[PDB]
Structures are given as structure tokens and as C-alpha cells.
Amino acid sequence: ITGTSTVGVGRGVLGDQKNINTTYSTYYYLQDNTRGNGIFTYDAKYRTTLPGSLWADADNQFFASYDAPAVDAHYYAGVTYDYYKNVHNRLSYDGNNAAIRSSVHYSQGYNNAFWNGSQMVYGDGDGQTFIPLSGGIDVVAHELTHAVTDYTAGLIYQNESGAINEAISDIFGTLVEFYANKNPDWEIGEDVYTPGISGDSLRSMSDPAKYGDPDHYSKRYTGTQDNGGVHINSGIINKAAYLISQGGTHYGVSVVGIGRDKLGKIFYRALTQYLTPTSNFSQLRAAAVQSATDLYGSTSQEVASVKQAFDAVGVK
Ligand SMILES: CC[C@H](NC(=O)[C@H](CC(C)C)NP(=O)(O)CNC(=O)OCc1ccccc1)C(=O)O
């Protein structure tokens, strides 16, 4: 909507206060004009019609319980935009400052979040498996990263290409979480998963097996559930990414860590210059090796570490 840029204040899902960029025209809307062609947050009102209504507020104060998921979807979309722009010189998900749209309060008891081809969508959870999912910065960044993938490599959402798609969202979700630097970790979804259980998470990149996911290609799932295991087999790639960044010895194979920034540069280049809709795990290894070669040189530690990490997870 046409209006003047304003700054509201509110509380997120976890009870933390933050400022949000809004737009004033009669009401204050969750419309951030400071980033690209805008970040827009919508109320789905417990229904499944999308996007719903652009979020309108009378006073620019967002402290109601009902406001909290909207505050976080809006704010964390901003952080994710900033990460891609500042770290990778990418302007929004399409590289041309496309408007970023999110809807919250999707459906009832809805234990998921997704990119629907056009926008991000967040359930509130059922209060047992999840609280409102936009409360996780890694979750928000995971979702926006699906849009980046769809505009770039275009990894088909099934089997190995789909597991790579998933891992790319977990990797950049995590890198955005570290960028914001509030309780960062290599776990996925810990801030909004199982409020009655401390210390767990939906997935782990550092040890995928903790939550039942494979950490070696020999343990891959090849059944039909979950689009051929896209959220399961992602553990193999998540583990490789974790090892590239942090190092470790895994099934006897030692990897020298090169740090998060270099992990991000290598995987961003692979995603945008080498991966294709049908890439499999072996092709991802080749893309990552080539990306590291471009960035750091064929004889570099970085290239050697990429090879060690994929060896460690059984991907040749
Ligand atoms: C709930 C666990 C898992 N979801 C996830 O791991 C994350 C959320 C997480 C980071 C909190 N959601 P996501 O991977 O974006 C869900 N994917 C999904 O709905 O794919 C199907 C789809 C395809 C095309 C258009 C709309 C939807 C799942 O769907 O199995």
C-alpha cells in the first residue's frame, strides 16, 4: 500500500521485544519499505486462503499474543534479506528485489511452514509439537531459501535433488541464525519445537542421527515417504556441510574445518552457478569442489576439506 515508512515495536513468539518496519496509511501495516521492493506480512486468520489480509494495526504497537507470529515472520524475513544482500550480494530471492510475502496464523494447529511457490506460510503449531513456527529464525530463513533455490538451481523436490534442496534450506537457515548471532547452533527448529521438551530439535546438522536421520550415504532412505526422504536424506548433506565448516572425524575420516563464511560462499556458488534441477549427491560434490576451486584455488585447503567432508559421508 501507499503510505509513509514508520517504525513499530512489539514482542515476538519467545517474548522478546523488537522494532519492526511498518507503513502508515490510516492503519499501520506490516510493510517494510526499507528492503528491496518491500517485505509484506499477512494474517491468514486460521484459514487456508492465501495470502489473507495485509496485517493492519491501529497503533503501531504489536504486543498482543496474536501479534507475535507476525512480528517474527516480518522481522526475520528482514534479517534473511540482509544476510543474502550483505553476504552474497543477492537482492531478494529472485536477485531483482522481488517483494517478500509471508502469511501467519495459517490453518489450525498447523505443525509446519512452507514456501507455496509465491510466498512463505507459517502455521501456529498445536502447542505440543510446535509453537508458532515463525519464532525460529532458522525456520524463516529455511523457508525463504526455498524461494532462492527455486529461482536458481531449481532442485526438483523429490529423491536426491529434493534432499539437496532441503539441506540448502537447513544450511542457509543455520548461516542466517549465526548471522543474527542469538543463541546460534547447528540444530534446526529448536526455538519453536516441542515447548515441553528442552534441549531437542527437529533436525541436527552436527549429528543427524540424534533425530533418526542418516549421516552417511550407506544409510540413505529410498522409499517413497516424504517425497523420497527429502527431510531425511538431507542429513547426509547437512553433515557434510557441518564438517566442512567445523571439522571433525566421522567414520574414521578426518575433515579440517574452514569456517562458516567459507562454507556459505562455496554452497552459494554451487547453488547459483552449478546445480541444476536434477542434481544428485555426487553432482553436488562436484559442484562444491568446483565452487571451492573457483574461490580458493585447486591446491587450497578449502578444496581439500570439501573432498574430505563428502568422503566422510560416503558421497563420491
Ligand atoms: C515438519 C517437518 C518438515 N518441514 C520442514 O522441515 C520445514 C519446516 C521446519 C524448518 C520447521 N518446512 P518445509 O521443508 O518448507 C515443508 N515443505 C513442504 O511443504 O513441501 C511441499 C510443498 C511443495 C510445493 C508447494 C507447497 C508445498 C516436513 O514437512 O516434513
Ligand SMILES: [Ca+2]
Ligand atoms: Ca496494536
Ligand SMILES: [Ca+2]
Ligand atoms: Ca538457536
Ligand SMILES: [Ca+2]
Ligand atoms: Ca538453529
Ligand SMILES: [Ca+2]
Ligand atoms: Ca523442544
Ligand SMILES: [Zn+2]
Ligand atoms: Zn524445507
